[PDB]
Design a protein around this ligand. Structure first.
Ligand SMILES: NC(=[NH2+])NCCC[C@H](N)C(=O)O
Ligand SMILES: NC(=[NH2+])NCCC[C@H](N)C(=O)O
Ligand SMILES: NC(=[NH2+])NCCC[C@H](N)C(=O)O
Ligand SMILES: NC(=[NH2+])NCCC[C@H](N)C(=O)O
Lengths: 405, 406, 402, 405
């Protein structure tokens, strides 16, 4: 089947996940926050928890693609490896006194360790001896500077955000935190050169790891192509209006979407994606974080030949849940709120098929409700995986998912 | 003479400054820390204090250029205004639905006002009424998002960092904090089009608003062309090795410097430039914040004709105050310690007008009484407002022409 | 002419203030924050400004009492000194290894100096060489531990908070931040022994520095005896409900008040920071916060086992206040034009006369239009402590109106 | 019955623990920060984990006492109950309007449950409908005010800290953070009225929940009666010199210790047992960066002193000082946190069960691996949930009876 994602709840054919790796081995107490993690994690156990997760879907007939294995196969291709380093290793990222050797040693590496380093990041102490690399070791100890030639990209674990598919099209997103900004290059190389993508039919709606985006930032966790030619997009936090306006315009220009419902998320330095406060568990069933979903102001954005920028905004008077409801042809949306006994946040489950969802073991209360609501809930352990502030939805990137209606 | 800064102590002939303005009237308790200010300031009083500063430099023969002025004149040439708006207003900065509204509006303003808007930023309601401004206005009144089309840039007040002159040439600095990165486009426009620059002779050693630069960040406050063919550059905080390398590489190619003393500064996300902890007051005098300077690891970048990159970095094994001293044929630097004997003192960051004549803040009476006992004449300005901005005289000046010392 | 405050706009006849001093001299980029200052200030300048604030007041016939002076006089009476030192210098505060040398050292000083220290705190370096003092220094030099035997109390500058007068009585307030709790004792001593107070006739409605009040915290800037046997008290930020309820109870039981309008505050800031009187029916306000104030009326009631009734007022805070004073409506000047400005916290010297800061030109001019003579002082240093005229004044005698 | 802890390494015969509970059910993402937790924890899971820890210690002969159980039994004695309530329910803690109600309500509950409320906190909501309680509900409803009459004390989980045995006696700690301060009254009530203590013999070196203490703070995690009349106490973070000085004196006056070794802790934002732990007779785990910065000071008795003590600064690294005081040439050391490591790891805070047997967290594989090579048996437990409270086995245990070596 032609690549493409046509809803949030239909049968999921092909997903991309990224297992914890070397990046997380590089987490430290004094750097985890800047690396967007609540704390260091026990990496080995996290690989086990992630694999079990891979397994629970790769036993449901879903073809789960792992990012390391894809990069790996992708760089085995000489051309493809030339394309990434040419843009990754440079005078402005690595240093003119190191670019040569860093690239040399990396090009020396077996494909699979190379790919491990493109995601995990490279430390001065990982290159062969040179005076260029020894002073770094020195800057870092002596002064407390970073020694990373290439940085650790632990959030690649969150494939939901680096790129997202919108009905047979994908966006290569300009990440908000600089800490996750280098991710797009890699995933972009994959779609560019990997056999699973290269001779495949599909559009690149918006994005370009080569271009500098400034204030336009978009992250997949804020994107949901729900099925009517309608697309939901959260705004004001990770995704900016500059960004949504250009994606919307593209999608309208190719007829990919008929309407985009912008979800205005009240501001907060506490950055949260749409999928963190609102998820789909089935045709007419969603879990939500009430406190945050009742504050959201929806604006419908539709194409407009009678407008210079070819579109028309309009603010929706009812509530987000009300708006999404009609936009799907519903009398209403069944609802499970995530905030008896302890606090719980069971938002961010991912649908595998309508009626089947994968979430975290620890949200027993939100999960029993989901079940009393006819949803089969498969749980995976959030002990380590969840320390990165994301769940099932955040750990998946749908590439092929069937429509619903 | 030619445009060019050849020391830190030599006779100041031409300085650029930027007066507090609209950008500052935009300060609020909730935005001031991201805008790099300690608190809101009384702008009319700031303006007075800044002009007192200008005046005290003007009555000494120094030619004091003020950024708003320069921007305004520059704006008069349609070409300069085209080049700037062409770059400041994109769907990636302002948004597909407000680009035409904004630029057209800005073009309707008289030069000096539009100048004030480019520096001070543009909010939604600053614009004539329209759907665009309104949808923009709601995002803020319902969701609390920023209405700023153009962002205010209050740190333009610190002329020192945005760009800097190293001997006979300038650098267009790619700022550390997002909140200052848009400053560079504005000054570059002046050096390009304004008459005092457009024809003058100087070299542009490093920089370009039109490029990404990525991990390369450089800031004037961390650059000192102390003279004798050397340049001191603080590293680790606002300025990165990725940038310095290129700077040192360019200065050597064109024989503008013979060596660069890279000052390795202890880390602290709490920012902090080299001129805030170390400062020349006189040819052999310097103020210093002990607690950070005696943690500086010195290094020397010298051009090496036989290296793929063309230069060697030897770590010095003497203290920074020793590596500096010796690089000016100096036995030893004389020092005045800052950061407190009666109360705390933050006397670094003064600025030399001529060997033996500095300008600093009135409040640092200790440091000042010592600079004076060490034979310096210290002129003072008020810190009450200009200082809630985290900067001193040095921070508020950008020498364009300062004489050789020797 | 008895002691008491019977309004916020009435003719001020006697006030306590405290100039900046040794405490502020101890400010640093590293402690200022925890000492409740936005930064290190220029002290001598600060002292000149405060002195201007004082002279500007005295020129109006107001009896302005300086805390350092009150204290200095107070400790000239041996019993007073002892009373204070016994409480202040213990093994739990100073350390058993230094209570003797610190005390005998302090008692050797000229009163004035002694007081400067009680208010400014005392460092290990200030002491006469001793081994006790040396390890103290050692803890500082080698590990960054505080070398203060007695901590600096720069917030004494804000006399408004540590104690407050309500219709013929005062409260010794259990302070909220550990950084200001040591203030209460100093002032209690003054009220206890100083001749201006010792023989004066007045009630102590609430408080005791010798008692640990646990969750009961109460700060001056949240209290306002507006008149009509009514009393305003902001709650939820620096003043807790546990403190407020026992304060009301005492007032009602001694007949010193008819009603207590609790001002429920959202989410630190005292009441006089987002609301304050400028004239008989005129106030300054910070819209964003005052519009959210939930008011609760607290009155006497034989029905209740704790003998008090609470009703949540349906109308806004501005109205309830209005009505409580017989006014149909209060005239309001908002503080959120050329720039942002916070001009709340002025202090009235009488009806129509107010002292505030030079910087708040926009609010000062609107106040002038409302017919108020606005005397201004410099905020450049004094305001870095986060407090205006109202915060730096503790009315002792102030007439009512009507 | 001779209670007393005369070592860190010797045979653990009696410890007190405190299982996670109601207190932890009240953790929220907006309140965990100030409750000293890294995040909310899966309480039911955490309970099974604690039980595993508890069972593992019992299966080895150690007498393990559950703080809730002790409280419960203590509560049944009317006197004890009243000794607690009189002190815990006052106009200053609960407010005049609700003191009577709260007390009657509590006094009407089953002991076990009343103990759970005493440790877990009470919410206005938990009281039977009443005008008083509804007012408190509205301060929370309309102003966002805390509605706790009594506060949850989830850190009771860390019995290490609220009290601590030092040879033949114990200290009733005046806690550092106000969030843990109300823990002391409860354990003191236990030690004062519960049959397992009221009759046993032991001294009370220092402490009193009735007193205020001011700047005298002191916590169990900083205290170590290592043996030889020697006691180690970390200074500067949770425990202050004004407290340490009073304790040393009390032990010196009663002849329970010869010397107190104050371990100068570098300035703040952690307890001593968090960067230094005994695993055997001559073996300790160490967190290099902080341990190499500790400045030891020897505090010995002294008649010549008006206050009876004299303290001297030592130039020997902390590790030597402890070695020397234990009569050892030097301590075997295992560094946590430059070997051949795979990731960050923090295996400090293990607790010994007896010489050569320790209980640590399963996640710290590298450290437990070096500990095993040093000849220590390392029983592990899950930190998935327990550890989000910032503490290990040493922190979750309060040795009551531990023989010396
Ligand atoms: N779609 C999501 N909810 N993603 C969660 C991503 C979490 C990751 N640590 C980040 O900061 O990006
Ligand atoms: N060279 C200097 N000292 N510059 C100081 C600039 C201060 C300004 N508020 C900033 O954070 O950028
Ligand atoms: N009534 C007042 N506004 N008092 C202000 C006191 C300011 C002082 N820094 C404090 O934080 O307590
Ligand atoms: N002895 C210890 N290591 N205790 C650790 C205590 C952890 C607890 N969350 C607190 O901050 O109090």
């Amino acid at each position: 089947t032609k690549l493409g994602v046509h809803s949030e709840a239909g049968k999921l054919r092909k997903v991309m996940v990224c297992s914890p790796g070397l990046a997380h081995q590089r987490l430290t107490p004094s750097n985890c926050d800047e690396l967007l993690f609540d704390d260091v994690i026990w990496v080995n156990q996290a690989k086990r928890d992630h694999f079990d997760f891979v397994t629970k879907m790769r036993e449901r007939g879903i073809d789960v693609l792992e990012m390391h294995n894809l990069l790996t196969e992708t760089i085995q291709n000489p051309e493809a490896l030339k394309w990434i380093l040419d843009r990754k290793i440079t005078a402005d990222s690595v240093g003119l006194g190191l670019t040569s050797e860093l690239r040399s040693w990396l090009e020396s590496l077996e494909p699979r360790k190379l790919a491990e380093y493109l995601i995990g990041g490279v430390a001065a102490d990982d290159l062969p001896a040179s005076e260029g690399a020894n002073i770094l070791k020195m800057y870092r100890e002596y002064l407390g500077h970073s020694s990373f030639l290439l940085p650790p990209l632990p959030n690649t674990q969150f494939t939901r955000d680096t790129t997202c598919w919108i009905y047979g099209g994908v966006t290569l997103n300009p990440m908000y935190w600089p800490a996750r900004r280098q991710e797009t290059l890699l995933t972009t190389a994959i779609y560019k050169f990997h056999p699973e993508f290269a001779n495949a039919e599909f559009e690149i709606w918006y994005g370009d790891p080569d271009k500098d985006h400034g204030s336009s930032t978009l992250e997949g966790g804020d994107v949901m192509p729900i099925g009517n030619g309608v697309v939901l997009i959260g705004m004001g936090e990770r995704s900016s209006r500059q960004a949504i306006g250009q994606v919307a315009q593209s999608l309208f220009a190719k007829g990919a979407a008929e309407r985009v419902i912008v979800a205005g998320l009240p501001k907060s330095r506490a950055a949260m994606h749409l999928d963190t406060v609102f998820s789909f568990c089935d045709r007419d069933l969603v879990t939500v974080f009430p406190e945050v979903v009742k504050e959201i102001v929806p604006f419908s954005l539709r194409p407009d030949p009678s407008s210079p920028y070819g579109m028309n905004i309009r603010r929706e008077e009812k509530t987000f849940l009300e708006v999404v409801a009609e936009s799907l042809g519903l009398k209403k949306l069944r609802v499970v709120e995530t905030g008896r006994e302890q606090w719980d946040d069971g938002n961010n489950v991912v649908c595998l098929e309508p009626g089947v969802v994968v979430g975290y073991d620890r949200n027993t209360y939100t999960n029993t409700l989901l079940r009393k609501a006819g949803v089969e809930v498969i749980t995976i352990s959030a002990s380590e995986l969840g320390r990165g502030r994301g769940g099932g939805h955040a750990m998946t990137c749908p590439i092929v998912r069937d429509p619903i209606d």
